[PDB]
Amino acid sequence: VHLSGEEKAAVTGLWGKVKVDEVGGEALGRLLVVYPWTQRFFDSFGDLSSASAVMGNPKVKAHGKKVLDSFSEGLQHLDNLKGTFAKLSELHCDKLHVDPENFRLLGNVLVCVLARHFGKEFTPQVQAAYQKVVAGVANALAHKYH
Amino acid sequence: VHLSGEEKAAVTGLWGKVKVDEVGGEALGRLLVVYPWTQRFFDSFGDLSSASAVMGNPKVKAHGKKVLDSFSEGLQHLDNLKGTFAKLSELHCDKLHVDPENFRLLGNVLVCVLARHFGKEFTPQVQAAYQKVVAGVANALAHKYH
Amino acid sequence: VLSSTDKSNVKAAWDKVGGNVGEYGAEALERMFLSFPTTKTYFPHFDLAHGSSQVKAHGKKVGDALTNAVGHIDDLPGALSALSDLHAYKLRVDPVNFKLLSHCLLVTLASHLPSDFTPAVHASLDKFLASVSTVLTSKYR
Amino acid sequence: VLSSTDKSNVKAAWDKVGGNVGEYGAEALERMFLSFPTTKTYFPHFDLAHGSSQVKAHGKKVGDALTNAVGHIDDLPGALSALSDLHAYKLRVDPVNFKLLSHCLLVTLASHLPSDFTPAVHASLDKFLASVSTVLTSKYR
Numbered sequence: 001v002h003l004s005g006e007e008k009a010a011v012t013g014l015w016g017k018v019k020v021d022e023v024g025g026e027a028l029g030r031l032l033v034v035y036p037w038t039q040r041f042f043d044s045f046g047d048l049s050s051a052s053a054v055m056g057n058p059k060v061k062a063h064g065k066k067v068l069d070s071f072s073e074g075l076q077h078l079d080n081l082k083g084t085f086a087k088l089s090e091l092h093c094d095k096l097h098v099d100p101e102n103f104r105l106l107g108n109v110l111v112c113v114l115a116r117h118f119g120k121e122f123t124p125q126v127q128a129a130y131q132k133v134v135a136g137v138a139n140a141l142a143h144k145y146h
Numbered sequence: 147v148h149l150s151g152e153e154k155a156a157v158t159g160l161w162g163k164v165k166v167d168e169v170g171g172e173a174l175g176r177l178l179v180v181y182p183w184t185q186r187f188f189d190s191f192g193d194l195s196s197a198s199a200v201m202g203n204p205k206v207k208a209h210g211k212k213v214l215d216s217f218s219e220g221l222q223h224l225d226n227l228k229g230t231f232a233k234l235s236e237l238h239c240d241k242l243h244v245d246p247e248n249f250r251l252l253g254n255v256l257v258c259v260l261a262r263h264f265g266k267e268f269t270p271q272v273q274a275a276y277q278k279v280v281a282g283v284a285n286a287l288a289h290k291y292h
Numbered sequence: 293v294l295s296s297t298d299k300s301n302v303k304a305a306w307d308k309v310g311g312n313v314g315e316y317g318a319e320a321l322e323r324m325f326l327s328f329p330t331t332k333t334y335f336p337h338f339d340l341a342h343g344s345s346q347v348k349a350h351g352k353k354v355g356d357a358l359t360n361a362v363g364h365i366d367d368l369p370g371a372l373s374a375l376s377d378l379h380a381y382k383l384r385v386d387p388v389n390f391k392l393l394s395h396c397l398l399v400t401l402a403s404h405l406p407s408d409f410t411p412a413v414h415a416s417l418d419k420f421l422a423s424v425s426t427v428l429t430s431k432y433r
Numbered sequence: 434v435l436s437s438t439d440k441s442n443v444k445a446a447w448d449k450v451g452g453n454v455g456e457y458g459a460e461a462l463e464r465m466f467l468s469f470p471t472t473k474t475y476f477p478h479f480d481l482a483h484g485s486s487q488v489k490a491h492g493k494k495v496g497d498a499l500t501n502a503v504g505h506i507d508d509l510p511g512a513l514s515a516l517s518d519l520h521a522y523k524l525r526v527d528p529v530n531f532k533l534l535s536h537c538l539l540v541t542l543a544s545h546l547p548s549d550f551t552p553a554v555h556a557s558l559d560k561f562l563a564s565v566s567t568v569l570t571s572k573y574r
């Protein structure tokens with residue numbers, strides 16, 4: 001879907017203030033604690049048996065950064081998300097066997113993390129623009145499953 | 147996704163034996179009893195307050211037939227489902243406000259109805275081919291939501 | 293399904309909410325209406341502008357209902373029997389909408405209580421709201 | 434959440450299943466593996482060919498567990514505590530897979546019992562399987 005001129009401005013403004021080395025790791029960690037079955041995809045990362053273990057794991061933090069960088073590329077090609085994510089969609093389907101419902105859950109955890117970091121600045125209006133972005137990314141990652 | 151030559155043959159064989167005036171009405175009725183919130187979209191159809199009421203309602207039966215006819219057109223254009231369902235996708239999104247999760251539920255209820263009607267003839271192999279068809283239709287109906 | 297540990301976590305979060313349950317209820321509703329415009333169709337009889345009196349009053353009702361659930365967390369079907377009657381039999385709300393409101397409640401709590409909203413507490417709260425949601429969309433007269 | 438009426442319906446269906454619970458368990462598994470090939474990845478240690486001895490044995494275990502649930506339908510968390518430990522803590526099964534197996538169990542019952550599988554009974558069985566699924570994917574030590 002199309003973002004309006006105002007929605008685009010709000011997204012660009014907040015994203016320039018994000019802690020690039022921090023936000024992605026917290027989002028991936030909360031996915032693994034809140035929705036505990038997601039731990040199975042990351043078995044090679046180590047001990048994930050309690051909330052404290054997941055949130056202290058170095059491999060979880062590093063991969064979270066790579067995920068954030070991918071969101072950042074998406075933000076520069078909002079009218080061609082399918083072409084941008086075509087290769088990654090093939091990977092998550094054909095090789096990793098991730099059910100697409102999990103793409104939606106990760107998007108919403110990211111939104112909860114932006115809320116925790118920005119407080120009063122994460123207004124209903126800023127949240128609304130980000131919901132359009134995370135939905136667009138989820139759909140683009142799912143497109144080669146069909 | 148592509149159906150194999152064998153999958154296409156199994157779909158064509160069973161569909162020629164379907165009771166056209168019966169199967170669609172039973173599928174729509176079971177949707178309304180098993181998943182009772184779906185009743186809200188059909189308020190103009192009358193009394194839907196108990197299992198017996200839903201399954202005896204004439205407007206539910208008639209609309210179920212129209213749904214079946216749409217599935218029948220889809221079966222003749224399996225490599226161009228998006229173009230075929232483009233108009234209907236716009237309607238269900240822009241005018242009717244139906245959440246796409248419900249398209250999946252209707253597909254699976256239809257499969258349960260085919261099982262009840264065909265018994266031992268609805269083998270694991272026949273079921274597998276029909277799961278590819280109902281997934282393709284659900285995706286095509288959702289495509290203009292994005 | 294909710295553990296003894298989950299019950300302790302939920303009660304801890306609610307202690308920190310203090311006297312603010314009504315304010316948080318109203319904010320969660322406002323976030324839902326703007327982000328997900330289709331949810332507005334369940335409230336055609338409301339004025340849905342920011343800071344409306346109708347949204348303030350309703351936010352207080354939703355909040356107070358959640359406080360009663362916490363106080364009776366050992367038997368949720370027993371405590372919520374009347375509210376289930378309303379949401380399941382009369383209003384016929386699609387379960388997808390309960391996911392949207394629950395998410396908006398979590399976003400609100402995260403915004404206001406950043407030091408109390410730990411990953412472990414986030415997990416217990418998501419479970420509690422899912423259990424409440426299931427009770428409210430079930431028919432059990 | 435399950436009503437008194439739901440409990441009566443589930444017990445009625447199970448009466449009609451009679452001595453065939455193990456056969457229906459195995460058929461439901463076979464339908465799941467063929468229709469939804471990704472589910473095979475939880476059983477890399479099995480021979481998954483039609484009529485295999487391993488699928489027959491496992492079908493009997495799944496079936497017998499459901500019979501115990503019916504007999505203790507007033508307290509499912511109490512009856513299923515050990516099986517939840519296994520599916521939630523050890524196996525870490527994605528909830529989407531419980532939806533696929535439950536659907537395949539309904540397809541199996543519909544195939545074999547067309548006169549007993551009424552819309553009202555279909556509704557009560559879908560609820561019972563959803564409740565069992567929630568218990569098995571929840572952590573409550």
Ligand code: HEM
Nearest residue numbers: 038041042066067070071088096098102103106107137141
């Ligand atoms: C927000 C949507 C997502 C984005 C943008 C994303 C992005 C990425 C990227 C860029 C990679 C590295 C690709 C490469 O090495 O070539 C990756 C790998 C991976 N992703 Fe995702 N991902 C998303 C959602 C998910 C979800 C929900 C799961 C599982 C529940 C998942 C599981 C994995 C796994 C297991 C790997 C491989 C990790 C490894 O072993 O190195 N992804 N993803």
Ligand code: HEM
Nearest residue numbers: 184187188212213216217234242244248249252253283287
């Ligand atoms: C299997 C996927 C579906 C197909 C192929 C389908 C097909 C159709 C067709 C052909 C029409 C008539 C279009 C017209 O009058 O121009 C229609 C109308 C309608 N559909 Fe669907 N539909 C599907 C799923 C659903 C679901 C899941 C719901 C709700 C939960 C729904 C709700 C409605 C409603 C409310 C109408 C208008 C009925 C009336 O008032 O006349 N549809 N659909």
Ligand code: HEM
Nearest residue numbers: 331334335353354357358375383385389390393424425428
């Ligand atoms: C945490 C979940 C929820 C709780 C605890 C809750 C609680 C309540 C309460 C306490 C009332 C007022 C009952 C009274 O008359 O005394 C109410 C009414 C209502 N609810 Fe909910 N609710 C929830 C979710 C939802 C959702 C997701 C929707 C739809 C998007 C919804 C739609 C409505 C509507 C339309 C009314 C009637 C409003 C009026 O005119 O008074 N509810 N709810």
Ligand code: HEM
Nearest residue numbers: 472475476494495498499516524526530531534565566569
């Ligand atoms: C109605 C829901 C289910 C029930 C009642 C059930 C029941 C059982 C039972 C009774 C066992 C054997 C326990 C023992 O060792 O004595 C078992 C094991 C197992 N289950 Fe389930 N199960 C269900 C759903 C699922 C699903 C959806 C999956 C994954 C797709 C799954 C995967 C497994 C696996 C991999 C084992 C270990 C098999 C072995 O090597 O023995 N289960 N289950």
